[PDB]
Amino acid sequence: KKLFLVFWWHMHQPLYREPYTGEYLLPWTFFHAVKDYYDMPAYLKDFEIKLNFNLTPVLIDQIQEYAQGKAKDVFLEAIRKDPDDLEKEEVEKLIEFTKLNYEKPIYRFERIRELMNKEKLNREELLDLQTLNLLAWCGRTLRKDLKDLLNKGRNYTQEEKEYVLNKYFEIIKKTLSIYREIKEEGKGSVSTSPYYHPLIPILLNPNCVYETTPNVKIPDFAVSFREDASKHVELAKEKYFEIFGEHPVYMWPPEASVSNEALELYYEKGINMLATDEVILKNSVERASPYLRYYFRELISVFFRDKTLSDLIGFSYHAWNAEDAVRDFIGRLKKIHESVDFQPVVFVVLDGENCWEYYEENGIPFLEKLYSTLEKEEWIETLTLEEAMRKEDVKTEVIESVKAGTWFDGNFLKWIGNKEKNEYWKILIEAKKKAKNDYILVAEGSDWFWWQGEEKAPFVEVFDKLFRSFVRRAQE
Numbered sequence: 001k002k003l004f005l006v007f008w009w010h011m012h013q014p015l016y017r018e019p020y021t022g023e024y025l026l027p028w029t030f031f032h033a034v035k036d037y038y039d040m041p042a043y044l045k046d047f048e049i050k051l052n053f054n055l056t057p058v059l060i061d062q063i064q065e066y067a068q069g070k071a072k073d074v075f076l077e078a079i080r081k082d083p084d085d086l087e088k089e090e091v092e093k094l095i096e097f098t099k100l101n102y103e104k105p106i107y108r109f110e111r112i113r114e115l116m117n118k119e120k121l122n123r124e125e126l127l128d129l130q131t132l133n134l135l136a137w138c139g140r141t142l143r144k145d146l147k148d149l150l151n152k153g154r155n156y157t158q159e160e161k162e163y164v165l166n167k168y169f170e171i172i173k174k175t176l177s178i179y180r181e182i183k184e185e186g187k188g189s190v191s192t193s194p195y196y197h198p199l200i201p202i203l204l205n206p207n208c209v210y211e212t213t214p215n216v217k218i219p220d221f222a223v224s225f226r227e228d229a230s231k232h233v234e235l236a237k238e239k240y241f242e243i244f245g246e247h248p249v250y251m252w253p254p255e256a257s258v259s260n261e262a263l264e265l266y267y268e269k270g271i272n273m274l275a276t277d278e279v280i281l282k283n284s285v286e287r288a289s290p291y292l293r294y295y296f297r298e299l300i301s302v303f304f305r306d307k308t309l310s311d312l313i314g315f316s317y318h319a320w321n322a323e324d325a326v327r328d329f330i331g332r333l334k335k336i337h338e339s340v341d342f343q344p345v346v347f348v349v350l351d352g353e354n355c356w357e358y359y360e361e362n363g364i365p366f367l368e369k370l371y372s373t374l375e376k377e378e379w380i381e382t383l384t385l386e387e388a389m390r391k392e393d394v395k396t397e398v399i400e401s402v403k404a405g406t407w408f409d410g411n412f413l414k415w416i417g418n419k420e421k422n423e424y425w426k427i428l429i430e431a432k433k434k435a436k437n438d439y440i441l442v443a444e445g446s447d448w449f450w451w452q453g454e455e456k457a458p459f460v461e462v463f464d465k466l467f468r469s470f471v472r473r474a475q476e
């Protein structure tokens with residue numbers, strides 16, 4: 001009697017490329033590419049387990065642009081330059097980026113603490129600030145290859161910085177290749193999402209928000225987004241087809257967001273299985289066990305992630321020592337295994353790149369111990385999405401209706417329902433009436449609405465510039 005364990009690591013960035021200048025106004029795609037997007041699948045080179053991944057099409061587009069040498073990344077240019085060539089504005093951006101990241105364990109260099117205590121930085125201090133920002137985002141693979149430069153911690157030269165940059169771009173250039181490799185080796189399945197990571201249930205029917213939050217105010221949706229919802233899914237199938245050579249049959253719904261109408265759309269577009277959140281299941285059925293494969297109206301298979309386990313990795317275990325965290329996680333799997341007489345399917349589904357910066361050593365001791373342990377546990381079998389979808393010795397249940405929501409409290413309030421978020425929807429609605437090109441799809445991404453109207457969101461001015469620039473460009 002096995003426990004079936006399914007990891008599904010979701011990878012996404014919104015489009016940081018400003019459409020009029022072509023400039024990447026934030027470096028987050030570059031930094032998560034060199035830290036996470038190659039290294040997370042590359043664990044499969046060292047550990048005999050299965051791991052699955054979601055890649056959004058808009059993330060893939062940007063990874064490609066960086067790999068081809070065509071991304072004009074303004075923050076990265078401030079890092080690359082000799083400090084004597086830095087603009088006043090660039091020194092400020094560097095310092096402010098450091099301030100934002102200063103307390104994360106991956107930034108634990110005493111030299112960074114020194115540099116932020118200084119009133120004015122000379123050329124050598126700015127080289128250290130530049131290079132330590134780079135090295136803070138070093139991924140597992142190059143953490144081994146560049147170990148000696150990392151331990152130096154100070155006194156970096158321009159040549160050493162450029163060496164690190166070149167190795168980082170080598171990692172980016174091999175990123176799509178490693179997803180193709182682990183896929184064709186059967187070591188993991190790769191899914192995608194609707195193209196720009198929108199909230200499909202809202203695009204199909206904004207009234208679905210009242211299924212969970214009847215008191216919310218939303219703007220006047222005087223235009224239909226139903227066709228755009230279909231386009232996000234169809235364009236995502238095409239982008240995935242181009243990269244991996246087949247149409248995707250697994251999709252991760254952005255923000256775990258489902259509704260009865262969204263599930264119908266995914267079915268109509270040929271998607272065979274998706275996953276969503278345990279809160280949705282609890283809101284939708286009485287006996288809400290996440291350890292079964294569900295069939296929505298006999299149309300499409302649905303797994304509900306184990307929210308506790310997913311949240312322990314995503315939010316809890318950074319505050320734990322690595323050995324104790326793995327002990328805790330394995331202990332919880334043992335409890336699940338002996339809590340049922342059938343073989344439970346245990347989906348662990350979360351962002352694949354955002355939690356690690358808060359762990360010691362970028363989460364590498366944790367994942368190395370976790371994967372080493374799982375590799376050898378005889379009562380656990382990790383599965384690909386394909387194996388989970390087609391496995392015969394599991395329990396199943398039919399579901400006729402879901403209550404529309406997301407994995408954030410089972411509702412849509414993180415993206416709609418206050419004056420500032422509603423203003424973005426109003427802007428989008430107005431622009432859609434006059435839209436002439438697919439930049440309107442870019443502006444439908446969930447990310448713009450998440451950062452709008454929030455207390456101190458970092459660089460929200462940049463997200464705002466991007467959203468409004470895409471909305472402007474969509475009408476031209």
Ligand SMILES: C[C@H]1O[C@H](O[C@H]2[C@H](O)[C@@H](O)[C@@H](O[C@H]3[C@H](O)[C@@H](O)[C@@H](O)O[C@@H]3CO)O[C@@H]2CO)[C@H](O)[C@@H](O)[C@@H]1N[C@H]1C=C(CO)[C@@H](O)[C@H](O)[C@H]1O
Binds near residue numbers: 100353446448
């Ligand atoms: C400002 C923020 O930008 C970057 O964050 C991006 C994430 O890295 C991406 O993975 C993507 O996240 C979305 C997920 O895919 C989705 O599943 C859901 O979880 O929503 C996410 C938000 O839409 O897109 C993000 C940008 O939209 C950057 O990587 C990240 O570090 C930056 N976070 C800063 C913000 C705050 C306050 O919230 C601090 O807590 C962080 O420490 C800062 O680094």
